[PDB]
RNA sequence: GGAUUUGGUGGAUUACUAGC
């Protein structure tokens, strides 16, 4: 419950560096500006590495064993992860700039191109233990009139060959013997060699150029040596090679433009396969798989990383990052639906299941502020700096109605009447909140009274009484619906520009701007308590600043709060550097999270050593699974979560339960104790150990026999199991089992099981229908068939 | 005793011991080694981090360290280590029970010496040959030659002959015959430390009495002579800067600066490592540059430097005293009670019957500082009550530490050995 | 010296501030003259510079949306940098003088809604002109409330 | 013995693989 990591970050597919195929090439990895984030193909699944990266990543480097990845900032510092472990093993400094780093075939050392000198060094042996001083050199060459542009790589560990931007190129042996066999640098290449390429066959070099003439160089006699001996040029009106990929078995050649042009050649034949524009902006970084069936281009102006397949005419994964940063993040009732807006106004639908966007939205011009869901799938809402509100239906991805104003007025933010009745929104130009109805796109009121803007806009499911947000430091509960038109004023200290609404909906969370938070009720006016967050807020300074980071009051305040569907905790984030965890009953703060350590943005670093973006939060939210809540960064969206369970959270330990004991139960036949013995410790193997060991005959018996203390408890171990879990059979006799068990008990403590329904019944509409509409449209097809006449 | 969850990676919190530190020179950049007992340490010398400590513990303690350029010559108890980057590349055993006391490297050999006056040649095997490996053969001195060996010294441009100190006389051993070429004449005090000089064909002596003696081995006689009140010559060194400077450090604790050109002492520092501990047991200006390198036995190793005269015209007479300049610090005696200071494990609180609390530094290792005892004036106005002559607090027993509000007011509370109260530390 | 003229009047940092708007307060009339080449009953046209003087009232630059004349003959760089914030702080008689505002602007003192804001040359939309204040428990916005004996530490103003 | 103010150096202020 208290321990959350850094499970994924979501959003910005591709920021700067190179972009490198795994040597299976299940996965691809894509490199952030201050982190690494790796993309199975073949599970659909994106994974990013709870390292930080103190600035953005100018190279990747990736083992052939893929034991250890190696990342290099543009400091020079070396961070190196073993793909497996997932932990940094070591962390040697560079002292100039890098510009790729290719291990070798042979692994034994790793070619590093950093100016105008080649160094190789020894790999530190992964399945070795960890030293004070594992980076080790083995040998560095200066004879370059300018520092090497690119490096590349032979099957053999002896040849290493860097092309330098002066237009000469040299090769390298990596044993000392074999110097006397290739040392020479080739001359003449117009404009600059951007890379060069070895065949399987070491006779032939295959040179590129920034002009865009290729030029093929082939050993042979005038005792003679190094000839050109075939020429290649490729027409580009404006267009020239900006980063070139070439694999030596299918002899493919990738070719980045400044236009963004992509064109595929072969080094025999000398043939143009395809020529497709990514984007108008130029490809910077493209890769080429062993296999070579998957291309992965990335173009850092418009941060977008595409990856296409030459063998057939399909996209494995096409996407694009938001071009600035999302202003609001919206949770759908399922939790792998997840909305998010951005400061250009292009709305796109993120997975949580996996990290890739199912469809964009263009239809606001203008900037989204706010994005929520109503209490339906149906569709959600989406706030504008544009002075219109558009609707979005999500199972035919288009605008019901765009709500408007009367005199056309900017929209901050949003309220959804959970009965899908009325939308609400605020503005800062007006105050007045403008009421519409859904169906009729009329605003049927404007809601006055406010001095100063609304800041936020909520509506409590259970009263269905929206709580407006205001600068003037009084909170208003309006009541809305049937003859009653009363609004209840509460005053409060500073301009509050946080509105959080409980579950409940009997309890207000809001954040002020003496940075604490306060909790109100609606029922009477009077508030529980008050949390005090001025103090374990982080503050950056930035670089242009003339106050220390102590006495600004930039971020002391909180720009976002969203309370857990247990209603017990608040996670709050605003402009600052920090997330935080306050318990709601306790008032203590659990956990405070720092965002990013990046040199790179403005507001990280509370002490400079002796304009730039700012990072801040902007939109938090807590999921329905309630693993981990998403904060919406500068660097992009964020997922915390729990799905390590790394953890021993004991409940009710004797002396006499061990994990041997439960497994001892098994034997016994004793079903509902090594349940119980399981639940005790709280370890997920030891619950799959009884979970899945115990009949379909004693399901129910133990059903009947579960107490109700464990009931919300087993219902969450059986959401989070059964999504990625091949039993749909036997996890569905569970959830009949529970259900049927207690049916009016669960129906009684609504409240008490939110978290454990939502979950239960996301698994059920995701993998449990499609399996029955399947198995149900291909019954009907065969009655068809046979019922029909025969045809002729 | 291997274990399967936990190895060892470093000791932490000491610099030296008191075995003689030997320094080394790669490239432009100096590096110097100590030794932790049984697991030596090298520090860098133009900022004194951590470069490099031994990678296995060796089975006793170091007894004598030296350095030739890469590699790093340490001896304990029966062997000879030949380490570089504190990997063990090459053990090489001597074939005794005894212990080796003192090692010398000079050319093609290797000179180890044990306590029973036997010493030892190694051979490089080829000139290609970085250490040397091979058994030479093996050099004796009976009682009736001299007595105990003091140190074992190479001066410059003698081929394969060994000044080899004793406590009664010096000799001189060539090692590719074994034979003694020359003996000297018998010394009326006991002499403890050695040191060449960077002079033609002399080797620095020095007594239990106070006198070092300037020796010469072409004339077999003694050029010049210094007198020292009631002091235990521990260390020898000469400034190679182009100004003659002896460097004398005794065994009280007081280093002793000496300038034979006018015959005179320059200034004398006064505890620079504490007398109990052993004093300076070594003491060396780094070659052609005015810094001397002082490492007592009481866990500490600091840097002194001479300042350029202020005089224009005359120079060489008006002398700037020494000047401290880096250091690092350590634990006298053993810790009572640590804890950890925060979560990225980058500070460790360790308070020791010393009775003075370090926060040293896990990250880096010149981080790492004592936390002042210097009592903040009250707020009510009443005077401190207190000894005069300021002593360190009670040894610490009990230290609690909670890192949630750090730098607004105190978060260690610690309680002291025998105190009815128990004070606090802002971190 | 025309820059140099109005870098007075308002108190510049740069004396490239003047041309660092005369750029933006000429590229204003170049897209004024060519919507002025499209023929009058053209509903691109018609919309298109109605969609433009909403901004360029919405900032400020220009006192009314009504004359259409206004867009080439009032919009001067010196109706621009009067929507500066210091000009703003002297306009609401916030500070004495336009030189002392921005001596509190560079100190620290002033602020737009949460946020304080540091550089002296912020653009204030006509809308967000109600926004500015001395920024809380500051030694200038002490000095006002006792003037009118109106403390309150409670506040700690 | 006590208090206030100030000049200068050294060590830190990112994570320790030696100089040309």
Not at chain 1, 459 to 470: G, M, T
Not at chain 2, 312 to 340: E, K, N, T, W
Not at chain 3, 29 to 42: E, I, M, Q
Request: with cysteine; charged share 20%; glycine share 6%.
């Amino acid at each position: 419950k208290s321990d959350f990591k850094f499970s994924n970050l979501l959003g910005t597919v591709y920021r700067q560096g190179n972009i490198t195929f795994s040597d299976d090439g299940k996965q691809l990895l894509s490199p952030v500006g201050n982190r690494v984030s790796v993309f199975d193909l073949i599970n659909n699944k994106s994974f990013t590495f709870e390292y930080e990266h103190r600035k953005n990543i100018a190279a990747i480097d990736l083992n052939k064993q893929g034991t250890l990845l190696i990342s290099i900032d543009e400091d020079g510092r070396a961070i190196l992860v073993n793909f497996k472990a997932r932990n940094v093993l070591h962390h040697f400094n560079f002292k100039e700039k890098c510009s790729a780093v290719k291990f070798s075939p042979d692994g034994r050392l790793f070619a590093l191109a950093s100016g105008r000198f080649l160094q190789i060094w020894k790999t530190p042996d992964v399945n070795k233990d960890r030293q004070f001083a594992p980076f080790v050199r083995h040998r560095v060459h200066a004879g370059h009139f300018q520092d090497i542009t690119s490096l590349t790589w032979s099957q053999d560990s002896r040849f290493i060959l860097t092309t330098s931007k002066d237009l000469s190129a040299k090769i390298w042996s990596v044993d000392s013997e074999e110097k006397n066999l290739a040392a020479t640098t080739f001359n003449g290449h117009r404009d600059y060699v951007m890379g060069a390429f070895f065949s399987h066959d070491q006779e032939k070099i295959y040179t590129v150029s920034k002009d865009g003439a290729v030029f093929v160089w082939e050993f042979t006699k005038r005792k003679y040596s190094w000839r050109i001996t075939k020429k290649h040029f490729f027409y580009a009106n404006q267009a020239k090679v900006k980063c070139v990929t070439f694999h030596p078995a299918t002899r493919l050649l990738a070719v980045g433009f400044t236009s963004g042009e992509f064109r595929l050649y072969d080094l025999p034949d000398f043939t143009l396969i395809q020529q497709l524009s990514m984007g108008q902006n130029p490809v910077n970084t493209v890769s080429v798989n062993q296999t070579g069936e998957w291309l992965a281009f990335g173009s850092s102006k418009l941060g977008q990383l595409l990856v296409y397949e030459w063998q057939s005419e399909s996209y494995i994964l096409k996407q694009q990052g938001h071009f600035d940063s999302t202003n609001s993040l919206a949770y759908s009732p399922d939790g792998s639906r997840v909305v998010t807006a951005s400061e250009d106004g292009k709305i796109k639908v993120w997975d949580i299941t996996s990290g890739f966007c199912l469809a964009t939205f263009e239809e606001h011009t203008s900037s989204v502020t706010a994005v929520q869901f109503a209490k339906r799938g149906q569709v959600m809402f989406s706030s504008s700096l544009d002075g219109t509100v558009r609707a979005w239906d999500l199972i035919r991805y288009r605008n019901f109605r765009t709500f408007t104003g009367t005199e056309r007025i900017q929209f901050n933010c949003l309220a959804v009447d959970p009965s899908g009745e009325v939308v609400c929104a605020g503005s800062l130009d007006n105050f007045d909140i403008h009421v519409w109805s859904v169906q009729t796109g009329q605003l049927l009121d404007a809601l006055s009274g406010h001095e100063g803007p609304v800041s936020c806009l909520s509506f409590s499911q259970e009263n269905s009484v929206l709580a407006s947000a205001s600068w003037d430091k009084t909170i208003r509960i309006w009541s809305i619906f049937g003859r009653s038109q009363q609004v209840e004023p509460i005053e409060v200290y500073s301009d509050v520009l946080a509105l959080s609404m409980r579950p409940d909906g009997k309890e207000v969370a809001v954040s002020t701007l003496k940075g604490q938070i306060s909790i109100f009720n609606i029922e009477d006016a009077k508030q529980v308590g008050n949390i005090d967050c001025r103090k374990d807020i982080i503050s950056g300074r930035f670089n242009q600043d003339r106050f220390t980071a102590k006495n600004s009051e930039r971020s002391k305040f909180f720009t976002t709060i969203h309370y857990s569907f247990d209603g017990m905790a608040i996670v709050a984030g605003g402009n600052n550097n920090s997330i935080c965890l306050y318990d709601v009953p306790n008032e203590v703060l659990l956990k405070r999270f720092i965002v990013s350590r990046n040199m790179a943005l403005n507001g990280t670093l509370e002490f400079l050593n002796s304009m730039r973006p700012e990072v801040r939060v902007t939109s938090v939210q807590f999921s329905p699974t309630a693993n981990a809540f998403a904060a919406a960064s500068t660097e992009g969206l964020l997922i915390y979560s729990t799905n390590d369970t790394i953890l021993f959270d004991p409940f009710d330990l004797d002396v006499d339960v061990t994990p041997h004991s439960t497994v001892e139960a098994l034997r016994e036949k004793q079903f509902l104790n090594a349940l119980v013995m399981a639940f005790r410790l709280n370890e997920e193997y030891l619950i799959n150990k009884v979970y899945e060991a115990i009949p379909i005959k004693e399901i129910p018996l133990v059903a009947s026999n579960i107490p109700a203390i464990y009931l919300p408890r087993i219902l969450k171990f059986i959401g989070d199991f059964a999504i990625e879990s091949q039993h749909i059979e036997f996890n569905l006799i569970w959830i009949k089992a529970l259900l049927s068990a207690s049916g009016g008990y669960i129906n009684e403590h609504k409240y008490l099981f939110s978290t454990a329904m939502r979950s239960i019944q996301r698994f059920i509409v995701r993998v449990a229908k499609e399996v029955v509409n399947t198995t149900t449209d291909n019954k009907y097809t065969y009655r068809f068939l046979v019922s029909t006449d025969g045809s002729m | 005793k291997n274990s399967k969850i936990f190895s060892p990676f470093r000791i932490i919190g000491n610099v030296s011991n008191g075995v003689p530190f030997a320094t080394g020179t790669l490239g432009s950049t100096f590096y110097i080694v100590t030794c932790v007992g049984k697991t030596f340490q090298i520090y860098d010398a133009n900022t004194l981090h951590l470069l490099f400590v031994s990678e296995k513990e060796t089975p006793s303690s170091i007894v004598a360290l030296s350095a030739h350029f890469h590699y790093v010559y340490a001896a304990y108890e029966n062997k000879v280590g030949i380490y570089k980057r504190g990997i063990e590349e090459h053990l090489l055993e001597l074939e005794t029970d005894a212990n080796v006391e003192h090692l010398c490297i000079f050319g093609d050999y290797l000179c180890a010496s044990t306590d029973d006056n036997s010493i030892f040649i190694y051979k490089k095997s080829d000139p290609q040959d970085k250490y040397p490996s091979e058994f030479y053969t093996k050099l004796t001195v009976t009682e009736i030659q001299g007595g105990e060996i003091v140190s074992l010294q190479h001066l410059a441009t003698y081929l394969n002959k060994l000044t080899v100190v004793t406590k009664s006389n010096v000799l001189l051993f060539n090692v590719r015959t074994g034979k003694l070429v020359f003996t000297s004449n018998e010394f009326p005090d006991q002499i403890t430390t050695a040191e060449p000089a960077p002079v033609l064909d002399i080797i620095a002596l020095g007594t239990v009495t106070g006198e070092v003696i300037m020796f010469n081995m072409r004339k077999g006689k003694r050029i010049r002579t210094i007198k020292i009140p009631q002091s235990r010559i521990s260390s020898l060194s000469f400034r190679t800067d182009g100004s003659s400077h002896l460097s004398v450090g005794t065994s009280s604790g007081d280093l002793i600066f000496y300038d034979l050109d006018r015959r005179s002492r320059i200034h004398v520092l006064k505890n620079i490592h504490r007398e109990s501990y052993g004093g300076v047991t070594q003491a060396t200006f780094l070659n052609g540059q005015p810094i001397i390198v002082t490492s007592g036995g009481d866990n500490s190793l600091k840097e002194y430097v001479f300042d350029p005269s202020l005089s224009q015209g005359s120079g060489d007479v008006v002398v700037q005293p020494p000047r401290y300049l880096r250091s690092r610090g350590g634990h006298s005696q053993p810790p009572s009670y640590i804890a950890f200071a925060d979560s990225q494990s980058h500070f460790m609180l360790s308070a020791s019957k010393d009775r003075s609390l370090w926060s040293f530094s896990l990250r880096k290792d010149a981080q790492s500082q004592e936390m002042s005892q210097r009592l903040h004036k009250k707020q009510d106005g009443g005077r401190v009550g207190g000894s005069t002559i300021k002593s360190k607090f009670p040894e610490i027993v009990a230290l609690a530490i909670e890192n949630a509000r750090i730098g607004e007011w105190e978060n260690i509370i610690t309680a002291h050995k025998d105190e009815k109260f128990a004070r606090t530390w802002d971190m | 010296h025309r820059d140099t003229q109005v870098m007075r009047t308002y108190h510049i940092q740069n004396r490239e501030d003047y041309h660092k708007y005369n750029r933006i307060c000429g590229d204003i009339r170049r897209l004024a003259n060519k919507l002025s080449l499209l023929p009058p009953t053209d509903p691109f046209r018609r919309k298109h510079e109605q969609l433009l003087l909403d901004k360029l009232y919405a900032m400020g630059v220009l006192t009314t949306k009504s004359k259409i004349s206004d867009l080439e003959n009032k919009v001067t760089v010196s109706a621009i940098c009067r929507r500066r914030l210091p000009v703003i702080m002297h306009r609401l008689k916030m500070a004495e003088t336009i030189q002392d505002a921005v001596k509190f602007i560079e100190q620290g003192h002033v602020r737009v809604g949460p946020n304080l804001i540091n550089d002296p040359a912020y653009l204030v939309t006509r809308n967000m002109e109600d926004y500015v204040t001395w920024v809380d428990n500051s030694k200038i916005k002490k000095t006002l409330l006792r003037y009118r004996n109106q403390i309150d530490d409670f506040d700690f103003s």
